[PDB]
Structures are given as structure tokens and as C-alpha cells.
Amino acid sequence: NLYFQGHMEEEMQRHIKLTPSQTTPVVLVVGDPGRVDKVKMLCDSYVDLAEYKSVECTYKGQKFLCVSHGVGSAGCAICFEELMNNGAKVIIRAGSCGSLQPTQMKRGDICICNAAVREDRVSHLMIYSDFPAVADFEVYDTLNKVAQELEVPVFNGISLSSDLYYPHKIIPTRLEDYSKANVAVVEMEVATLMVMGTLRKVKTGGIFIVDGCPLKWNLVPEKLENMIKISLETCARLAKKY
Amino acid sequence: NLYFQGHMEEEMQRHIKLTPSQTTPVVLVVGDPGRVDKVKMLCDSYVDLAEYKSVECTYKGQKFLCVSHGVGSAGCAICFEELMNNGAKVIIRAGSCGSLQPTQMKRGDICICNAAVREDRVSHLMIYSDFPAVADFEVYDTLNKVAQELEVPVFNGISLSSDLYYPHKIIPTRLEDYSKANVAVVEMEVATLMVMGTLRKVKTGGIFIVDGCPLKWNLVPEKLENMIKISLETCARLAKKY
Amino acid sequence: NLYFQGHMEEEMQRHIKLTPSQTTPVVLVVGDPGRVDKVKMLCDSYVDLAEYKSVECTYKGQKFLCVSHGVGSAGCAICFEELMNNGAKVIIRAGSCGSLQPTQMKRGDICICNAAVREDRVSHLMIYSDFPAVADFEVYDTLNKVAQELEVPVFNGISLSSDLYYPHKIIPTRLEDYSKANVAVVEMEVATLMVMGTLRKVKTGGIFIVDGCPLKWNLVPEKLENMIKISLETCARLAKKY
Amino acid sequence: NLYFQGHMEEEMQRHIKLTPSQTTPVVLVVGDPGRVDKVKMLCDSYVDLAEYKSVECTYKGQKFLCVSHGVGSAGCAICFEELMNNGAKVIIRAGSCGSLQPTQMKRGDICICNAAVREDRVSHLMIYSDFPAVADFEVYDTLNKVAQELEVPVFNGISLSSDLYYPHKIIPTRLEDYSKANVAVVEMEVATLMVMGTLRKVKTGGIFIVDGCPLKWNLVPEKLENMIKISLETCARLAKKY
Amino acid sequence: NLYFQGHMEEEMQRHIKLTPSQTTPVVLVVGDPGRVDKVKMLCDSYVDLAEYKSVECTYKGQKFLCVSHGVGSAGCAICFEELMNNGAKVIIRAGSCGSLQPTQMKRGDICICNAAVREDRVSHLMIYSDFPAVADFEVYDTLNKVAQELEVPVFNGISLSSDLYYPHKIIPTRLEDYSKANVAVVEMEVATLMVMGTLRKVKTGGIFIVDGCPLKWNLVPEKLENMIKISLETCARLAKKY
Amino acid sequence: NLYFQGHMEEEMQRHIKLTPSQTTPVVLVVGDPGRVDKVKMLCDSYVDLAEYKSVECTYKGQKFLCVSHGVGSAGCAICFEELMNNGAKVIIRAGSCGSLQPTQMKRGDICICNAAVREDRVSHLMIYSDFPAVADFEVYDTLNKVAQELEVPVFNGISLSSDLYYPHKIIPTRLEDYSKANVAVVEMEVATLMVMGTLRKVKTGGIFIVDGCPLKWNLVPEKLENMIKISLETCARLAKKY
């Protein structure tokens, strides 16, 4: 029965404008508001939670958020921070990537990454460069298990998280070197998520669809749908744990 | 190195207008702003932290807050709540009381109470009436030990926390019954503090100086100073533990 | 990172031999090195800053200097100048005075003065005689407020600053006239301080203990201690403002 | 009328051995004592102010200093510091430079620079490398306006301030790269002056005569005289503002 | 940056269980843990450094240890040794003594001793009997100066350090002879401290309050407090020197 | 006669497990336990002082230690530290090196080095890279004088101390550059010893036998014996000084 004035509402996080009660244990982060729309329409139902776009998805009986950045920002580092502030336990980044292995991975193929090269800027503000950007094994394993069950072929490998390629349309100088070092793909911010996750004891992972082959200088609808279905099914499975 | 916009300042509590960094592990709560002034001038030094009055006291090398309510409120229940929200570990209420045992305790005598009768209103919003309002044993014991060391005589007993006597100048109907039931003194809100403390795992206690004998229908300066010195010395000792 | 040779130390003032970093916003000036010793022993702690005696006092958590002239000089006009050169914001002169109102003020009584008669020599080198020697109102008010709080009775009035009485043991010819004009007491250099303060936008005040009644032709320890406590408490309060 | 012993002379700066009263609002800095001699003989009159050479120039009715370093030092960073300590408001560096644009600027041509590459050593002790070395726009504009009025053709561009080229006769490794990046000329310390100026709110500029073309591996008297006349006329014009 | 495994902590002394960093230049040794408690409560603040009891006292801004032996030992010879091993520069022994001059010194009087008769056992293991047990003159002088300033009357003289009187409640056979030889008082171990001090170039002294008159066959609270205040003030003054 | 419990044994250093009494003024450090065995059998007699191998050698009447690291460590930086902690005054490193000057120094030749390139890792934890790794001149001179007297030809020059070559069998990238810069040989840790020596005022030197020519991509018994004899004779001579 004890309700104090000024203590009736939860603390809202500044940018994503969500409270802990609005924040689910599992969160799917995608790259733009349009993609959030694509994802939510593949769910059983959704609730819009109206700079940063947030929707509560229901898929196979489980509730999880789907979040992206909006106009005015370059990525979702702040999203990761605020989601974790609100008690998120699992965050999965899903999006596009460029293939650095032309003879193994072509446009439309799907990569589930276990670790990342930190060319991402933000992670270096958190911890020294020697620290590994690495996925949570359970998230990584679950994504792979789900793909196997859906009979969707995937590749596994290290990703290059670049503050240049997607954000600025700039080819990193070390891109060829990393290809030779067996780096599978290039994306934007999964390394940021991985590192923050480790530092804050939050489980992370990444899944990406190849949109191009940058070193050779529009996705396939079915292939993109497959990547999204893996993401949604994985989020549902993990959500049951909480 | 990672500082996010809108995440540079701590959450300030609505009424006391303090952040966790401003809040010490040990807090002394007194009954009015004037008494806070009396207390702070008996300390080694103090820092004013400018509805609710707050000062950081330094006494015998230790930092602890001294807090009271200001104009516009009837007590400090909200203070207790917000102090505990900010991580306070020990809260001691010091103030005046009325003696319910005229032949044992007279004006100027000091009572350190181990438990309280819940005629306080607020505690009943938190938990059923059958639940005991009881001090933390370590706080109670420390207050008694400090008085012994200072060679200040004290009484120990149960207090009646009344929402009528001090707040409204009204004599509770059960006051005589409680006197016969061996209740030592009557004060305002120590039961509120005790119950909230138990519910929130925060250590509490109370110390009071007799200002009158209500059932027989200006304090002694030295006696009041003694009660304050016990409070300050006790706060200092407990502060060392954190 | 840019340190130039010959620019590593601050400018030291010629006579008091202090730098701006050594000079506190608030300064207490007393009449002789022995009195500086008396004052510093009443403080919480002190640091000797070794013609002119300077000590950094700590009292109720605040740092302020206590300064006097040494062997070889007649007063502290040069001290005032150099302290203000080093950025002092408040200077209070504390010392002895002679009562010019025998039926109102006797030996041991304390006077806090709001203005001064300029029979001091030095002020006339700064500005025409018509200009008033007047205390800063906030300093004057604070000294009075502090005395009230300490329950020390005081008198308020105009002082005669004389270049003859204390320096040369000479009775000024106008002393009786000034008594009739309601001048309260006679001291040495507060008018010098007041005028320089006004000219240089530095806040000043004065507090004096009656050591004698000159027109009737060893202080009380407790009374002297009271005057010093008022000075120290006032300095502490003002020091908080900076 | 108030003159204190030891307070009759102004603070003299350690190296240039000048007081604020000796320091004009506008100062022309040149590269060696011989050049100071050349400049002063082109003025209406001058006063020698006898490691560091200083002369007060009078030109077109206005007083400004002309300063250089002497035997025992490598540049005038300390001069800039001490001049600014003494209240200088405008400092212009005039001297020689090497052309990095052989097909646009040849020996004897004059460059008025708007900014500088910081290969100067000293500026990096003051502020991070990312901070721009940039002239004050009014100084830059005035130098250009004066040249236009004198019908002296000039070039405008960025200068490379090098701690190697003039001081040590060493060709910087990046000299060719900077030429390709449209850097106009190479000189010694204008970047040092620019940065210190910005940091200390002092207006700066630079004007240089091409003495050579370093990347192709005795000045023209009339051309050198023109550069000096622009400097002197500009200093005179700015001096009127103060 | 060079930290070797097994070389990160300082050598702790075996019995007092303190490192050099924990050991202050000045140390006050008292006779039992209870007295350490009495002393620390008269200080501005203290820090417990938990057989041998040690506390870091802060008094008038200066830090110094207060040490005593605990249950299981007869004195503090080992304490003296280990304190000096840890770099202590001044050690003062304060405690009780018995008066050997009944007509000059009575119960509650205070003696500051300049030398001691070596009936102490331990000193004879260090050096031949002919060697004098003598205080450091500066310590002795400072204790006397402090008492004078506090207006506490004291006596000065030689002490008998006895391994029998306090340790075993045994009257030494030579006690009467020493009284006739103008020995002032009898205590326990100051001779041990003096001799070790001389041998190890550590400054020592002693101050004692008369608790009885042994040859005639509970102290006064104020008198004991005075002796302690002299000790604390002296320790503070000496501490400033280091 | 004064022996305190717990103060009867000297402090033993953690890793080498030696006390100051066990540590001689002069110490010979070699590269492995087998080589210590080779050295000790060339001495007049030896005493085994049983991770780190230590033997007290007697040669030509003088006592000095011969020390190496054992299984579980990569070098003797910790040995150097602990030997110096125990009061060692001279430490000489003797061992193998690779020739960087194929036309001047071949397998079996002996180099006595005056300074070292710091590619050693550990020295950089102690002091900035600009600080020179340099031998003590007396040690260097004595080694050369001894070789001359023994009629053993030697080379003198700078050594490259590499954390890669001997420890990891890795060719440093700058090895060819250093050869061209007139660096004589490559070894492991002499730079570490030199720098620590300078920082701690301990005299150091190095002597090495060429075991290979790394840039061209089993020692001669007599040649190795000569290098050891120089080491032993030098240690003996220096030992006489202490």
C-alpha cells in the first residue's frame, strides 16, 4: 500500500525512452526502422512502443523487443547501454554484412559469428585493444542449432566490426589483410555489443546476411527471410529461459 | 573512457534532492532544520547540501549526513525511503519524546528504544499490524555502549510512535493503557523507520530526550547536548564499518 | 605540458613573502606574533608559513591565513596591500581597543565596528579625507550574527583609527571630542584596511576587545577567547563562500 | 600618493627583460637581431630597449615593438609567452620561408598565411595535435589589405611550421606529402605563435618571403623591403586600435 | 611500472604486525590497551590498525601511532625494536610512576625525566651497565615547553626503570638508596627505550604521572588528562618536523 | 646479547631464496643450470646453495655467486632485482650471443659489450625508451684488461638485447637494420641488467661468446672455456675491492 509521490513511475532511459518494465530479458537489435517493420510483420503480433525505434514482438508465445536507431544517430551503442541498464540479459544483433571470402560466401549467404575484430571505435573507450570481442557461446550455439533445425545453411567465423564501411562507405585499409587472416565478413557494431556484453555480464551474439563482396568492388527475399526467422526463433527460445 | 550523453549525472531522489554519491552509509535524522543546525555546529566540520534539509557532517574523521524535513511536510517517511533508495545502510532517528513513566523518567532524561508501538499511520501501509517495529540490535547496543563510555545515564524501553501527539498536539486515547503496558516514552515516527528498515534490510535505531510528561498534563542545554553527542559518536563508530 | 624556465614559481610578495597559491580568500590580521600563536592554538590545526608572521589556519574544515607584523614595523598596511595583490577577498582585523564610552563599554567588552575615524596616516595617502572609512556590510553582519549564535554580547559603533595611541603611546588631542561625537573605541589601523578595501574591492571588517579606558587615565582570558572565537568562526563561514 | 617599498618597479619578464609598461599592444617578431636592425632603420625612429633583442619602433605615429631571439636560443616561443604575459594583444611573425609550390611561388615572392601545419614541437606541449594552428582573421585580412594598398602582390596559403628545416637544416620526411596537400610554404614557428595566441586570446598572423625552393634542392632587396613595409604598415594600423 | 611477484607487499614486523608505511615518524607508547583507548578518544580522530595494540592517531592535523602491549607480554621492548626497524624517528613512553620523593611529588603530579637508572633487565643485553640511559634533549625540552604552554606544572628528574616494581609487584632492594640519591620516580621500561634509542639513533623521552608513593607503603581524572594532553601535543609538534 | 624472537633469521628473497649474508658483493649470472655446473667445476671450490640455481664460487681466493634461472622462467630479471635487494654491488652477465657482423665476428669469438639496444621488454617497465642501456665503465674495462692479460682476443661493441631471439626463436624485424647501425651482437637480457644497475647504482657488464650468425640463417670447447675464465678472473678481481 505504500506509494510515494514522485516514485510512481520507473526511471526511463534517456534515448530509447524505455523503462525496465518495458524491457524484455531478450532483445533483437536491427539496423534501421524499416527492418524493424519487416521483422514485426513476421511476428505473431507486436506492440509499438512510441530517434530510436522500439517494438515489443510476440513470436511463438514469447515477448522480446526489436530495436533500431532512427534518424540522427550512426549506430546503437547507446541502445546497448540503456537496454543493459534496464536489465536486458541477451542482446542479438542481426543485419547485413560484406563477404571477405568470395569463394566461400556469396550474396545472400548467412554468417553467425563467434568473435569480432574491433575496428569499431566505441569498444576502445571501454577497454584496451588486447581484450577479445567474443560472442556468448550459448547464444552462438543456439543460433546455429536453430538454423540446423530450420534447414538453413550458414557459415561461422569472425566478423570485422568497422566504423568506416557501413557508416561512411569507406573501405578500411586493413580489409585485405583481414581477409587473408581468415576473417569471414565485415559489419558495423557487433564488436561493440560483444565487448559491452562481456564487461556487463550480458549475453550477446550476431547473425548477418551477405549483401555484397567488398573486395570484388538488394538482398534475395527468401534468404533475408531465413536470416530473420533464425533470429526470431532464437530469440523465442532464449526468452523461455527467463 | 565511455561517457554517454544523458548518463553523466546520477539519479537524484525527488524530495531530498540527493544522489547516491551524496548519500553516506550512515544517516542521522532529526526533527527540524534548527536542530540540524544545532547538530552541525557540534561537529568537526560540515557541508550544506542545498522542503528537506541535508548537511554532510564530519565528526571524529567520519562522514555522515544529518537530515530533517522542512516547511510543508509532517515527518520524514519520504526521507527514509529516498535515503534507502540511495544506499543508506544505517539510519538513526534522534529527537524529543514524552515520558510515560513519570516516576522513572523525567524531563531531560534520555531513552534509547529497542522497539515501538505502531500508532504511526505510515507503517500500516507497508505491512500488517501484527509485524513488530523493532530496532537493529547492533545500533541499539552501540548507542548504549557509547552512552556508557560517555558516562551519560540512559533508559531503555519501548516507544509509542504516534501520528497524533507531536504532529497534531493530540493525546492518543490509548496513552494511559500503553503506560500501564510498560511503554517508556511517546515520540513520532521511529516505528515507521524501524519497519521500513526491516523490510528493506537497513539498520535502524532511535534515541530520544524527554521534553515532557504528557500524562501529568525548553530542554536542559547540557542534557540535550549529551543526547546529541551520543548520536554523533554512535554515527561515527558505525560509519567506520563501511 | 608547457613549462618555461624562470616561470615555474609564482611571484612572491616582497614583505610577507607569500605567493597567491599560499594566500587564502579570507585572512585574519592580528596585532603581534604572540597573538598569532594564541589564535593558531585555538584552531583545529595550523601550518607555519616561514619581519611578518604568517600561518595557515584550519578551523571547522576551512583554511584561512592568520597574519601579523613582526619586529621592525609599526603596523600591517604593507600586509594589506600584498594580501590583496595575492587575491585576498576578505580581510578582518582583530585586536585590542580603548573604550571612549566608559559608562557603556568597560575592559573585556567586545566592539564590532561599522566605520572608522581616519586618524591613521596611511589612508590619506590613498584618498582625500572626505572619503569614508567603512566596513563591508556582509563582514560586519556576519561578525554580529556569529557573536549572537555564540551568545557573546557585543557593542557596535565607530572606531577611531589612531597613528598615535597604540603606536606611540600618545593621547590624540581630539580623543575627548570624538568621545562626545559618539565614537565607541580607539584602535590602530582598521581605517587603513577599510579604505584600501573599498578602493580595491576587498571586503573588510574589524573586531576589538577593550583593553582600557584612555579618558579615565592584561585582558580577561575568557573574554579574549570569546573575541578570538568570533573571529575564527566568522572567518570559517566566509571562507565557505569561496 | 601611496608608494610601498619593493613595489615601485613593475615585474620584469625573465628572458626578454621587459615590463608591461615597456610592452606595446602590437608586437612584430622577426628571426634575428640583424633583421631587427634592418626593420628599425626603415621606421620613423626607434628606441633600443637593452639573449633577446627588443626595440620600440615608431612608424606612421604609432609605437610597437620589434623583437627577436639572440645568441643562445633556437626560436621565440619564450618571447611569445612573456610578451603575452606583459599584455601584448597582437603578435605578427615576419620572416623567411621556403616555397613548396615551385610553379606558383618563386624566390622573393611573399606569402601571408591563414593557418599552419604543426610540425613545430612546442605547440604539442600546449594542446593535442588535432587542434588547428590558425591565424586571427583580422590580422590576416589587414596584412592582405595593406599589401593591396601598397600594390605588392602576395600569395595566401597554409604554412608548414618545422622544428627541423630552419633550426637544424634538415628536410622533413613529410615535406613532399605536404606540398601535394597544397601547403604553400615552410617556415619555423608560426604554428607555435598561432596556437598560443588562440589559447591566450591574443591575435596573431604571419608574413613570409620565399628564400628558396627546398624540393628543387640572399633575397632580392626590393622584395624583402616590400615584405617589411607590409609588416610595418600593418603593425601601425593595428596599433591605432589600442 | 615494474612490479615483481612476491615483492608487492612491504615486510611486516613479526609482533606488532606493522609495515614501514603504517609506521609514523613519531610514536607514543603507553602501558596497556585500555590506555590506548583513553588516548585515541582524546584525539581528533583515529584508525585502528588490527598481542600488541596499535592505532594511528590524528591530533592537531598530525598523524602518529599510539601503541601498547597486549595480553601475553610483560612490556614493549620488542615494540621499540620493531618500530625502529620500521623507521620510527621519535618514540615517547607515557605512563604511571611511583614517587620516590614524598615531600616534593605526590599522587597525580607529573614527571618528565631526563635520564633513568637501568634496573630494567633488557638494556643490559644491549650494552654494558656503565652506559647512561638518557633522553633525547629535544624531546625532553619539547615535553617541558608544551607543559609550560598548557600551564601544567611538572617535575623533572631521573627515573628508576624497574623490572620488578610494576611487572611483579616487588619492591626493589635499592629503592630507598635511590630515593636518597635524588632519583625522582620509579617506572618500568623507559631506560630500555632510552638505551635502544641512543644505540639506534632514535630520539626518546618519557612522561609519567604519579600513581603512588611506594616508600610510604585510581588517578585524578583531570591530572591524567593533562599528562595525556602534554603527550599528544608534544607528539603533534615533533611530527611536524618529519 | 639482544636476540628477539622472530628476528633471528635474515629476510630471504622470495625467488632466489637467498639472504643478504648468502649474497656476495660480486655476482656472475649465466643462462642455465648446466652452465652454472660448467662454471663451478672450473673454480677452485664451490658450495651449492639449495626454480633458480645458486652456487657460491671460490676462485683465486675470492667468493662470488654464480646464478641462473631454472625450469619455469624465461630469464633472470627477478634474480637481478633480488640480488640487488640483498646488496650485490657488481653483477656480470655471461652467455651466448649471435653475431650481427659476419665479416668481423664468427662462431667462438668473444664480445665484451659497452651498451645495449633495449629490445628486452623489462627495461621499458622501469624507464622511458630514450634512457641508455650502458655498462659500468670499470666492469667493462676490467673484463677487457683481464682478456688482454690472458691473451684472449675479444671484440667490443653494442649488443641487441632481444625478448624474441633466444626466448622464442624469433628473428627480430629490426635485426638487419641494427647490423647496419654497427650493433655487434644479439643476446637476451643484458640491457635489462644495465638499466636496473644504473637505476639502482649497481655496477654491471656483459661478456658473450658467438654461437651463430643469425643473418646468415655447439661451441668450441677451448673458446667457451676462455670466455668463462675471463668471467671468473674478472669476478675475482672485482671481489677484492669489497
Side-chain angles (χ1 to χ4, degrees), chain C residues 94-105:
Chain C
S96 291
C97 70
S99 177
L100 303 188
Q101 304 299 335
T103 62
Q104 302 178 242
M105 266 171 289

Side-chain angles (χ1 to χ4, degrees), chain C residues 1-2 4-8 10 12-16 18-37 39-105 108-136 138-144 146-147 149-175 177-215 217-221 224 226-228 230-232 234-240 242:
Chain C
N1 289 195
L2 190 51
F4 283 106
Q5 191 273 319
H7 287 85
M8 304 296 289
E10 287 187 319
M12 204 187 307
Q13 294 287 307
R14 210 248 74 118
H15 292 91
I16 64 176
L18 293 185
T19 63
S21 72
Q22 292 179 290
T23 308
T24 51
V26 179
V27 184
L28 184 60
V29 180
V30 299
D32 66 53
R35 178 58 59 74
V36 174
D37 292 337
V39 167
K40 73 188 189 180
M41 296 302 297
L42 297 162
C43 291
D44 300 339
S45 65
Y46 73 86
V47 173
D48 286 327
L49 306 184
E51 298 172 14
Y52 296 87
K53 182 164 180 84
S54 293
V55 176
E56 182 195 75
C57 299
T58 305
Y59 185 76
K60 306 292 161 198
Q62 307 300 309
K63 294 182 160 179
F64 52 89
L65 298 185
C66 186
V67 178
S68 74
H69 79 97
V71 68
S73 54
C76 245
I78 185 63
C79 320
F80 304 148
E81 177 77 352
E82 296 185 338
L83 290 167
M84 296 184 196
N85 287 348
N86 283 346
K89 302 301 185 194
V90 170
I91 305 179
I92 296 168
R93 184 56 163 88
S96 291
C97 70
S99 177
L100 303 188
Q101 304 299 335
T103 62
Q104 302 178 242
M105 266 171 289
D109 288 347
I110 291 162
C111 175
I112 292 167
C113 53
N114 65 313
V117 182
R118 297 171 55 198
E119 285 212 352
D120 69 296
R121 191 70 202 87
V122 173
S123 68
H124 298 278
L125 304 180
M126 299 192 274
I127 191 61
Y128 307 106
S129 300
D130 294 334
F131 186 95
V134 64
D136 179 74
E138 172 177 10
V139 176
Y140 170 81
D141 194 39
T142 305
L143 287 159
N144 282 311
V146 165
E149 292 183 32
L150 299 174
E151 303 175 17
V152 180
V154 299
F155 297 77
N156 293 126
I158 293 156
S159 178
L160 167 68
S161 290
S162 176
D163 67 336
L164 289 178
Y165 184 67
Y166 282 110
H168 294 293
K169 318 307 172 194
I170 288 167
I171 305 295
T173 296
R174 299 170 173 182
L175 201 63
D177 292 339
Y178 282 125
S179 181
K180 295 174 178 179
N182 296 323
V183 179
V185 301
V186 57
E187 41 68 62
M188 190 177 51
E189 64 189 350
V190 83
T192 309
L193 177 56
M194 284 168 178
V195 171
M196 189 183 305
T198 305
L199 295 190
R200 300 196 57 182
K201 305 189 196 197
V202 169
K203 297 169 150 276
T204 70
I207 182 164
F208 301 94
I209 186 162
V210 178
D211 68 6
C213 282
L215 295 175
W217 318 122
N218 308 136
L219 289 162
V220 178
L224 175 58
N226 286 341
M227 187 276 278
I228 292 170
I230 294 166
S231 301
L232 293 174
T234 299
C235 284
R237 296 204 188 178
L238 294 167
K240 290 188 172 198
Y242 301 95

Side-chain angles (χ1 to χ4, degrees), chain E residues 1-2 4-8 10 12-16 18-37 39-105 108-136 138-144 146-147 149-175 177-215 217-221 224 226-228 230-232 234-240 242:
Chain E
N1 289 195
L2 190 51
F4 283 106
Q5 191 273 319
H7 287 85
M8 304 296 289
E10 287 187 319
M12 204 187 307
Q13 294 287 307
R14 210 248 74 118
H15 292 91
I16 64 176
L18 293 185
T19 63
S21 72
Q22 292 179 290
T23 308
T24 51
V26 179
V27 184
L28 184 60
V29 180
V30 299
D32 66 53
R35 178 58 59 74
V36 174
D37 292 337
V39 167
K40 73 188 189 180
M41 296 302 297
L42 297 162
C43 291
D44 300 339
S45 65
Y46 73 86
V47 173
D48 286 327
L49 306 184
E51 298 172 14
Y52 296 87
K53 182 164 180 84
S54 293
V55 176
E56 182 195 75
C57 299
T58 305
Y59 185 76
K60 306 292 161 198
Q62 307 300 309
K63 294 182 160 179
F64 52 89
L65 298 185
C66 186
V67 178
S68 74
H69 79 97
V71 68
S73 54
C76 245
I78 185 63
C79 320
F80 304 148
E81 177 77 352
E82 296 185 338
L83 290 167
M84 296 184 196
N85 287 348
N86 283 346
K89 302 301 185 194
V90 170
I91 305 179
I92 296 168
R93 184 56 163 88
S96 291
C97 70
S99 177
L100 303 188
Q101 304 299 335
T103 62
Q104 302 178 242
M105 266 171 289
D109 288 347
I110 291 162
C111 175
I112 292 167
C113 53
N114 65 313
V117 182
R118 297 171 55 198
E119 285 212 352
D120 69 296
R121 191 70 202 87
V122 173
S123 68
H124 298 278
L125 304 180
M126 299 192 274
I127 191 61
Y128 307 106
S129 300
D130 294 334
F131 186 95
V134 64
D136 179 74
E138 172 177 10
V139 176
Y140 170 81
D141 194 39
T142 305
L143 287 159
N144 282 311
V146 165
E149 292 183 32
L150 299 174
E151 303 175 17
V152 180
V154 299
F155 297 77
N156 293 126
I158 293 156
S159 178
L160 167 68
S161 290
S162 176
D163 67 336
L164 289 178
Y165 184 67
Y166 282 110
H168 294 293
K169 318 307 172 194
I170 288 167
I171 305 295
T173 296
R174 299 170 173 182
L175 201 63
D177 292 339
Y178 282 125
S179 181
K180 295 174 178 179
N182 296 323
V183 179
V185 301
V186 57
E187 41 68 62
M188 190 177 51
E189 64 189 350
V190 83
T192 309
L193 177 56
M194 284 168 178
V195 171
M196 189 183 305
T198 305
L199 295 190
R200 300 196 57 182
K201 305 189 196 197
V202 169
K203 297 169 150 276
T204 70
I207 182 164
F208 301 94
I209 186 162
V210 178
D211 68 6
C213 282
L215 295 175
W217 318 122
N218 308 136
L219 289 162
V220 178
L224 175 58
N226 286 341
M227 187 276 278
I228 292 170
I230 294 166
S231 301
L232 293 174
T234 299
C235 284
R237 296 204 188 178
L238 294 167
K240 290 188 172 198
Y242 301 95

Side-chain angles (χ1 to χ4, degrees), chain D residues 4 16 21 37 45 53 56 65 73 92 98 123 151 168 184 191 195 219 234:
Chain D
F4 283 106
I16 64 176
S21 72
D37 292 337
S45 65
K53 182 164 180 84
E56 182 195 75
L65 298 185
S73 54
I92 296 168
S123 68
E151 303 175 17
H168 294 293
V195 171
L219 289 162
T234 299

Side-chain angles (χ1 to χ4, degrees), chain F residues 1-2 4-8 10 12-16 18-37 39-105 108-136 138-144 146-147 149-175 177-215 217-221 224 226-228:
Chain F
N1 289 195
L2 190 51
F4 283 106
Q5 191 273 319
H7 287 85
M8 304 296 289
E10 287 187 319
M12 204 187 307
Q13 294 287 307
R14 210 248 74 118
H15 292 91
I16 64 176
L18 293 185
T19 63
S21 72
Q22 292 179 290
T23 308
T24 51
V26 179
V27 184
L28 184 60
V29 180
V30 299
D32 66 53
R35 178 58 59 74
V36 174
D37 292 337
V39 167
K40 73 188 189 180
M41 296 302 297
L42 297 162
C43 291
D44 300 339
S45 65
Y46 73 86
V47 173
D48 286 327
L49 306 184
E51 298 172 14
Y52 296 87
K53 182 164 180 84
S54 293
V55 176
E56 182 195 75
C57 299
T58 305
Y59 185 76
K60 306 292 161 198
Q62 307 300 309
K63 294 182 160 179
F64 52 89
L65 298 185
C66 186
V67 178
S68 74
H69 79 97
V71 68
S73 54
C76 245
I78 185 63
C79 320
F80 304 148
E81 177 77 352
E82 296 185 338
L83 290 167
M84 296 184 196
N85 287 348
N86 283 346
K89 302 301 185 194
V90 170
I91 305 179
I92 296 168
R93 184 56 163 88
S96 291
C97 70
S99 177
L100 303 188
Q101 304 299 335
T103 62
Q104 302 178 242
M105 266 171 289
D109 288 347
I110 291 162
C111 175
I112 292 167
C113 53
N114 65 313
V117 182
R118 297 171 55 198
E119 285 212 352
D120 69 296
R121 191 70 202 87
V122 173
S123 68
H124 298 278
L125 304 180
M126 299 192 274
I127 191 61
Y128 307 106
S129 300
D130 294 334
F131 186 95
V134 64
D136 179 74
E138 172 177 10
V139 176
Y140 170 81
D141 194 39
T142 305
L143 287 159
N144 282 311
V146 165
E149 292 183 32
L150 299 174
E151 303 175 17
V152 180
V154 299
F155 297 77
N156 293 126
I158 293 156
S159 178
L160 167 68
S161 290
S162 176
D163 67 336
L164 289 178
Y165 184 67
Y166 282 110
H168 294 293
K169 318 307 172 194
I170 288 167
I171 305 295
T173 296
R174 299 170 173 182
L175 201 63
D177 292 339
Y178 282 125
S179 181
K180 295 174 178 179
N182 296 323
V183 179
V185 301
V186 57
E187 41 68 62
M188 190 177 51
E189 64 189 350
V190 83
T192 309
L193 177 56
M194 284 168 178
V195 171
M196 189 183 305
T198 305
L199 295 190
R200 300 196 57 182
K201 305 189 196 197
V202 169
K203 297 169 150 276
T204 70
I207 182 164
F208 301 94
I209 186 162
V210 178
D211 68 6
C213 282
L215 295 175
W217 318 122
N218 308 136
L219 289 162
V220 178
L224 175 58
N226 286 341
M227 187 276 278
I228 292 170

